[PDB]
């Protein structure tokens, strides 16, 4: 359950990063 | 019990970061 | 039951997101 | 031995990446 | 050993992902 | 045994991608 709370983690993460990117490209387009 | 909610959790995220990175690849075509 | 779902899930949110960061290489690719 | 360090290891990079989303937002913001 | 396969497949796409972020941002600065 | 390699695996990828976060933030500040 250590390593189960690390996974909720890392999935909490690569959904701001996925938010991040989303902001980014939005930007690019202009 | 835990460690499979992560992953489902892990698995979510990570469709929402292939998304963006397409958004993210189309703003750079675009 | 839960876990092997939870692995079938994250196994093809990779390759989403192995197809995703292809695309993404070849937009980064004038 | 092995699994516990493989999981200290895991968490730092978790804050790295933490901070450097918390970065990239700040940068995304005007 | 199947939850194993999938996180080494998950640090290899990320591995990548870094990559292709770093290719981004050199042709952002310029 | 193979999950604590994974993992170690997962977190080399997660500091090679917060660097390059912080390289994309810097170049977007840029």
Known sequence: ???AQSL???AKSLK???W???EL???LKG
């Open 8 to 10: 909720k983690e890392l």
């Open 25 to 27: 490209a939005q930007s």
């Open 20 to 22: 991040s990117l989303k």
């Open 1 to 3: 359950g250590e390593l």
């Open 16 to 18: 701001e990063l996925a």
